[PDB]
Design an enzyme around this catalytic site. Structure first.
Site, PDB file in Angstrom:
ATOM      1  N   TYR A  88       5.628  10.593  -3.894  1.00 35.15           N
ATOM      2  CA  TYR A  88       4.226  10.268  -4.060  1.00 35.15           C
ATOM      3  C   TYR A  88       3.358  11.219  -3.262  1.00 35.15           C
ATOM      4  O   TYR A  88       3.397  11.225  -2.020  1.00 35.15           O
ATOM      5  CB  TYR A  88       4.006   8.789  -3.700  1.00 35.15           C
ATOM      6  CG  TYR A  88       4.863   7.911  -4.583  1.00 35.15           C
ATOM      7  CD1 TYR A  88       5.839   7.086  -4.058  1.00 35.15           C
ATOM      8  CD2 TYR A  88       4.728   7.959  -5.975  1.00 35.15           C
ATOM      9  CE1 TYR A  88       6.647   6.301  -4.895  1.00 35.15           C
ATOM     10  CE2 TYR A  88       5.521   7.199  -6.800  1.00 35.15           C
ATOM     11  CZ  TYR A  88       6.484   6.373  -6.260  1.00 35.15           C
ATOM     12  OH  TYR A  88       7.278   5.607  -7.108  1.00 35.15           O
ATOM     13  N   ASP A 141       0.227  11.380  -2.188  1.00 38.11           N
ATOM     14  CA  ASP A 141      -0.886  10.456  -2.038  1.00 38.11           C
ATOM     15  C   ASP A 141      -2.221  11.227  -2.150  1.00 38.11           C
ATOM     16  O   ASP A 141      -3.154  10.752  -2.810  1.00 38.11           O
ATOM     17  CB  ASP A 141      -0.732   9.681  -0.723  1.00 38.11           C
ATOM     18  CG  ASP A 141       0.442   8.683  -0.759  1.00 38.11           C
ATOM     19  OD1 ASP A 141       0.964   8.323   0.313  1.00 38.11           O
ATOM     20  OD2 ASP A 141       0.922   8.206  -1.811  1.00 38.11           O
ATOM     21  N   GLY A 196      -2.785  14.640  -3.394  1.00 39.37           N
ATOM     22  CA  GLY A 196      -2.944  15.425  -4.611  1.00 39.37           C
ATOM     23  C   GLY A 196      -2.911  14.677  -5.928  1.00 39.37           C
ATOM     24  O   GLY A 196      -3.609  15.051  -6.886  1.00 39.37           O
ATOM     25  N   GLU A 197      -2.114  13.608  -5.990  1.00 39.24           N
ATOM     26  CA  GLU A 197      -1.952  12.813  -7.206  1.00 39.24           C
ATOM     27  C   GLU A 197      -2.882  11.603  -7.236  1.00 39.24           C
ATOM     28  O   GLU A 197      -3.441  11.276  -8.276  1.00 39.24           O
ATOM     29  CB  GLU A 197      -0.501  12.352  -7.370  1.00 39.24           C
ATOM     30  CG  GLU A 197       0.433  13.463  -7.785  1.00 39.24           C
ATOM     31  CD  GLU A 197       1.894  13.050  -7.752  1.00 39.24           C
ATOM     32  OE1 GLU A 197       2.268  12.105  -7.010  1.00 39.24           O
ATOM     33  OE2 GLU A 197       2.718  13.697  -8.479  1.00 39.24           O
ATOM     34  N   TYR A 198      -3.032  10.942  -6.107  1.00 39.62           N
ATOM     35  CA  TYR A 198      -3.801   9.686  -6.081  1.00 39.62           C
ATOM     36  C   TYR A 198      -5.214   9.799  -5.519  1.00 39.62           C
ATOM     37  O   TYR A 198      -6.057   9.007  -5.901  1.00 39.62           O
ATOM     38  CB  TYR A 198      -3.047   8.607  -5.314  1.00 39.62           C
ATOM     39  CG  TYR A 198      -1.871   8.040  -6.072  1.00 39.62           C
ATOM     40  CD1 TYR A 198      -0.580   8.473  -5.802  1.00 39.62           C
ATOM     41  CD2 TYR A 198      -2.040   7.129  -7.114  1.00 39.62           C
ATOM     42  CE1 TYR A 198       0.513   7.980  -6.509  1.00 39.62           C
ATOM     43  CE2 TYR A 198      -0.939   6.643  -7.825  1.00 39.62           C
ATOM     44  CZ  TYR A 198       0.324   7.065  -7.515  1.00 39.62           C
ATOM     45  OH  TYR A 198       1.410   6.571  -8.214  1.00 39.62           O
ATOM     46  N   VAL A 243      -6.636  10.330  -1.642  1.00 38.29           N
ATOM     47  CA  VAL A 243      -6.675   9.332  -0.561  1.00 38.29           C
ATOM     48  C   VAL A 243      -8.081   8.935  -0.177  1.00 38.29           C
ATOM     49  O   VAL A 243      -8.301   7.804   0.303  1.00 38.29           O
ATOM     50  CB  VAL A 243      -5.916   9.763   0.732  1.00 38.29           C
ATOM     51  CG1 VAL A 243      -4.460   9.945   0.465  1.00 38.29           C
ATOM     52  CG2 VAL A 243      -6.497  10.979   1.355  1.00 38.29           C
ATOM     53  N   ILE A 270      -2.813   3.137  -0.308  1.00 33.70           N
ATOM     54  CA  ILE A 270      -2.217   3.671  -1.527  1.00 33.70           C
ATOM     55  C   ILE A 270      -1.037   2.750  -1.860  1.00 33.70           C
ATOM     56  O   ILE A 270       0.040   2.917  -1.314  1.00 33.70           O
ATOM     57  CB  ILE A 270      -1.735   5.122  -1.316  1.00 33.70           C
ATOM     58  CG1 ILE A 270      -2.856   6.059  -0.824  1.00 33.70           C
ATOM     59  CG2 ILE A 270      -1.111   5.676  -2.589  1.00 33.70           C
ATOM     60  CD1 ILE A 270      -4.012   6.173  -1.787  1.00 33.70           C
ATOM     61  N   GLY A 271      -1.263   1.750  -2.713  1.00 35.71           N
ATOM     62  CA  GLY A 271      -0.262   0.760  -3.057  1.00 35.71           C
ATOM     63  C   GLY A 271       0.261  -0.045  -1.874  1.00 35.71           C
ATOM     64  O   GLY A 271      -0.484  -0.819  -1.259  1.00 35.71           O
ATOM     65  N   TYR A 300       1.404   1.448   0.958  1.00 30.22           N
ATOM     66  CA  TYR A 300       1.165   2.193   2.203  1.00 30.22           C
ATOM     67  C   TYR A 300      -0.273   2.058   2.652  1.00 30.22           C
ATOM     68  O   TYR A 300      -1.134   1.975   1.805  1.00 30.22           O
ATOM     69  CB  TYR A 300       1.310   3.726   2.164  1.00 30.22           C
ATOM     70  N   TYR A 321      -2.711   4.173   5.631  1.00 31.68           N
ATOM     71  CA  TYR A 321      -2.651   5.280   6.568  1.00 31.68           C
ATOM     72  C   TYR A 321      -3.992   5.501   7.214  1.00 31.68           C
ATOM     73  O   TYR A 321      -5.005   5.560   6.516  1.00 31.68           O
ATOM     74  CB  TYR A 321      -2.329   6.594   5.866  1.00 31.68           C
ATOM     75  CG  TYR A 321      -1.041   6.726   5.069  1.00 31.68           C
ATOM     76  CD1 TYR A 321       0.174   6.927   5.687  1.00 31.68           C
ATOM     77  CD2 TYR A 321      -1.073   6.675   3.693  1.00 31.68           C
ATOM     78  CE1 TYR A 321       1.320   7.093   4.943  1.00 31.68           C
ATOM     79  CE2 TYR A 321       0.073   6.835   2.940  1.00 31.68           C
ATOM     80  CZ  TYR A 321       1.254   7.031   3.576  1.00 31.68           C
ATOM     81  OH  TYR A 321       2.377   7.188   2.809  1.00 31.68           O
TER      82      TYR A 321
END
Ligand code: CU
Ligand code: CU
Ligand code: NA
Ligand code: NA
Lengths: 619, 619
Positions: free
Chosen positions: B288, B290, B292-294, B296, B371-372, B374, B376
């Site tokens: 994941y 976090d 680049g794809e999602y 943050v 993120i789901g 996690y 941070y």
């Protein structure tokens, strides 16, 4: 009842009285070390026997003694004459601090060296520096200090700014004789002052800092009973103090539900050494064992509220012996407080709708000591989540030299003509483990990379391996940061609810260990410092990684000797000794007084608990 | 003026308007990413041109676009159609989160799998998980998410306690088709709940924590102007915010006497990836990104006072675009405060009689994202002494699986039948350096051990060496903790008063880097994570170590592509990319909600200043 209570003024007075009555403390005797001994294993069921260990020096030149006294029973248990040529000299005495300068000031060789540099003898300070063991046969069995000189332009001047390079002297502090004066040639004495309270150097003081107020309106969350027993947020321990080691933690345990579970029986910094990396014969002999040679506890600072320790502070004021056996208080020498430590745990859940945040805190037990130019803070931390941590904070003034014309591979430039030789500060933490009791073992855990192929077709798998250290001969270990190496201390006979042995994992900082050539004097005298982790079988007389008498003592004692016994450590009463240090190449920013730098280690629970131990922390 | 000011609601709405006017934002279009671009090099003399970059998705199946808009001038600067099979898919869209579960709920294969496990479909949560790039040729050019299932017994239940192992599905979220459902067989769904607010699990909440009150009666020592310009204790910077990167620091500079001296031009966490080390086909594809794809920043939490951020807090509330180009505020998304940081410097001098103690502080700029499973915390710190530090705090709920009968080399047991696959959390800090301006270079510094012999007769000497990284081909570096390896960024044209180049030294934690086999998909897609330090020549289009489009994108972009240009970095405008991460073998203590763990790095001045920069700090 408290057998781990701090020594009281009355107990030291009584040791003095017992020693006097027994003929061991006449007018020529001086106490170089005095401390209470820990209770013997399994002594809890019997009545208290407070015993004290004493190193007694004789100013008339007679041999020193090691004595154990029972203050409970008013008796001498044992008294033994020491042969220092064999087992080592006693620690440096407070009162010898002035003697090196005083003797040198009427020596013709020393005066000639000062006159060559046009230095007024009344302005020349001489540091009383531990001698080590080198090529000088005449020093064997003699109490020697070496002397390096620094010029003080006036009473409030920082002499560290004005090192006198090219010059060193050796002095017998018992016979009061100067054995050698070495002058390899004049170097310019650096001229700029290093007076960090002089407005000329500081400039106008900042007016931009607004106050920060830390208060506890209902007081602190820890209790102190029996003088030194702490209970805080499931933790239980006793705060001891020793003139050599400083603050010592005993009986670190955690209340998990209805059971008081031991974790560490005794935690201390059992040695610390400062080896220097300058090959000049003026300094190539210097290695300061602040703990073993100077005794860091004895120079613990009195700590001022709102300056040294901020917040709601509870102080301990440990009592030590002066040279004659009279008690002396170190007022506010130990700080104890709790502080906020940010977020403990947090989750905002996408499916349950529950948002949850909790805050962390830690209990802090600290002291600060001064050894010549150096000042060190020793901090122990206990966290809500079961983590135990040590942090050393290094500050003071850097030890200086001249900066050679044409530069140096072993010395940094700080100011015009002013150098700072490279050095390390290397600590040894002695952790007498008691993970759920005394039946413990240590495993080395490494990350294990896996090859793409059958069973791992996408090449994503990774694992770990654990290697039990079964005997002392297999228990001298080095760091491997690349493979994420840690060490787990577990109890093979105590399992968690998942049927896995309970344990704690030691996380090191993986800083460099002792850099000296393995054939050097310091590599032998500080052998502990050459490896990151040692594990021994517990023995009551194996207290320091360098032995009982470090001053002018060759190899022979300490960890290498202990380990030679090759004892079983696989499910036994064991002790972990972790080496960790700072390697210091001084920077201009360290001058004229150094900003704090830090090093340490921590241990985190590893299947010790049956789930998070902080679910009962409230919002 | 402030060209580095935060994006305003008005600017976002205006971008929307410009796009609409241009025919680029019809009803089928969605904004997947929108952010302000930094000013070009050499801007300052020329007027403001606020430019925004936008990734535009099309729900009807048309190709997405990358667009740059000048909001100042009301124009489209550039618009280009993307071929996603070549350059990558756009980031995951908020609205796609629900789609995986919704599509699977009427798929007969999925329903058969759930029926085999006696699971009510209404209770089965499905996580919308990034797909990466593996062996499935039909996925190339399609927006795929993979789904892993977790049972929720009731609305407020933590589904993470009840993973459904042996089952995974792949879904095309644009065509709304389920492409594959893989069932490798039934595993028991772990039955214990993980509800960390349920009194039955927490027990009675502690009543032992007395309050800690942190206040600043005169307010904070920092100022905020232009909405996001901070001045604090000689430091100057601008606090930016981007939906991908989160908090971004701009123009970090220090006022040394009369001169504002730059140190870092831009600091950000430019990627973060969580690769999993379980070779089960159910999870062996999971990595994941976090950042680049999602994205943050887009999921940054609103931070509650006294709970998330303690003390006298100044908040920023950044504005982002929703999927339609309407502005959306993240209220109290960024915390700013100063805090006490113990002793700064201390010395009690034996010869001068002067006792001196000063306290440290640090400025803190932070945010927390979810993120789901996690959560941070990203923390930037500036210290009085010139030190700059980043810290990541990892918490949330661990990602779970079944725990296999007979154990696992790649999964930890947390509770009966409940596992947690091994994984890493690996960050990339992109530090566009400006040490005293843009003409910079990097040296690798190792400790050098020296052999006993001529010139070093006592075998005590040690030294160091510095190796300049002259070109990008030589600037991909690995840690060496054993030799105390660090990296110094200096300005070869700016010298301190000792005629030495000014510099800052980067101190890494030296944790393991990416463990996956070098032939894996993740080693190529997260090539940056395989080495600790990269140095590139600055270019405006080299923003992320993984390139602009990470989702379902193979290797071909990012750092390995940038470095191939082999540009001069010896006294040039350079960028340091530091990889650092946590390797997580979950412990029972991490369950059911994990205590914070941390990783980071720091940079300390290294002959940047002419002496300590904190001599003017008052008692
Ligand atoms: Cu030092
Ligand atoms: Cu993790
Ligand atoms: Na033990
Ligand atoms: Na740069």
């Amino acid at each position: 009842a408290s057998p781990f209570r701090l020594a009281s003024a009355g107990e030291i007075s009584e040791v003095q009285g017992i020693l006097r009555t027994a003929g061991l403390l006449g007018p020529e005797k001086r106490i170089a070390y005095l401390g209470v001994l820990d209770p013997a294993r399994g002594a809890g069921s019997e009545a208290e026997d407070r015993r004290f260990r004493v190193f007694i020096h004789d100013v008339s030149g007679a041999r020193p003694q090691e004595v154990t006294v029972s203050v409970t029973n008013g008796t001498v248990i044992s008294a033994v004459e020491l042969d220092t040529a064999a087992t080592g000299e006693l620690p440096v005495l407070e009162e010898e601090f002035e003697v090196v300068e005083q003797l040198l000031a009427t020596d013709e060789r020393w005066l000639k060296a000062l006159a060559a540099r046009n230095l007024d003898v009344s302005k020349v300070r001489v540091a009383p520096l531990s001698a080590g063991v080198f090529e000088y046969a005449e020093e064997r069995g003699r109490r020697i200090l070496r002397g390096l000189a620094f010029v003080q332009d006036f009473p409030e001047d920082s002499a560290w700014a004005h090192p006198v390079d090219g010059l060193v002297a050796y002095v017998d502090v018992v016979s009061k004789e100067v054995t050698r004066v070495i002058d390899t040639g004049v170097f310019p004495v650096p001229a700029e002052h290093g007076n960090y309270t002089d407005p000329e150097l500081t400039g106008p003081l900042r007016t931009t800092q607004k106050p920060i107020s830390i208060t506890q309106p209902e007081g602190p969350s820890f209790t102190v009973t029996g003088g030194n027993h702490i209970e805080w947020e499931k933790w239980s321990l006793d705060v001891g103090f020793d003139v050599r080691e400083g603050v010592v933690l005993h009986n670190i345990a955690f209340r998990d539900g209805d059971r008081l579970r031991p974790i560490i029986n005794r935690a201390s910094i059992a040695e610390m050494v400062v080896p220097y990396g300058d090959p000049s014969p003026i300094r190539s002999w210097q290695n300061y064992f602040d703990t073993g040679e100077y005794l860091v506890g004895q120079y613990a600072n009195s700590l001022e509220l709102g300056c040294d320790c901020l917040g709601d502070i509870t102080y301990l004021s440990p009592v030590i012996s002066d040279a004659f056996g009279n008690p002396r208080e170190i007022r506010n020498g130990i700080c104890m407080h709790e502080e906020d430590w940010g977020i403990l745990a947090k989750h905002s859940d996408l499916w349950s709708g529950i948002n949850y945040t909790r805050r962390n805190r830690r209990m802090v037990i600290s002291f600060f000591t001064t050894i010549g130019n150096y000042d060190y803070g020793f901090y122990w931390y206990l966290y809500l989540d079961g983590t135990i941590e040590f942090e050393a904070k290094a500050t003071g003034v850097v030890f200086t030299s001249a900066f050679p014309e044409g530069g140096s591979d072993n010395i940094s430039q700080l100011a015009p003509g002013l150098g700072a030789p490279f050095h390390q500060h290397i600590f040894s933490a002695r952790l007498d483990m008691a993970i759920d009791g005394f039946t413990n073992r240590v495993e080395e855990e490494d990350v294990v990379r896996q090859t793409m192929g059958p069973g791992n077709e996408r090449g994503n798998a990774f694992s770990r391996k654990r290697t039990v250290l079964t005997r002392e001969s297999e228990a001298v270990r080095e760091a491997d940061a690349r493979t994420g190496r840690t060490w787990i201390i577990s109890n093979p006979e105590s399992k968690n609810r998942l049927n896995e042995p309970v344990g704690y994992k030691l996380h090191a900082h993986n800083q460099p260990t002792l850099l000296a050539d393995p054939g050097s004097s310091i590599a032998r005298r500080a052998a502990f410092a050459t490896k990151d982790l040692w594990v021994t079988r517990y023995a009551d007389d194996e207290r320091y990684p360098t032995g009982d008498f470090v001053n002018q003592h060759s190899g022979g004692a300490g960890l290498p000797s202990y380990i030679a016994q090759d004892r079983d450590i696989d499910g036994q009463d064991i002790v972990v000794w972790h080496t960790f240090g700072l390697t210091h190449f001084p920077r201009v920013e360290d001058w004229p007084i150094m900003p704090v730098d830090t090093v340490g280690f921590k241990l985190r629970p590893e299947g010790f608990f049956d789930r998070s131990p902080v679910l009962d922390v409230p919002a």
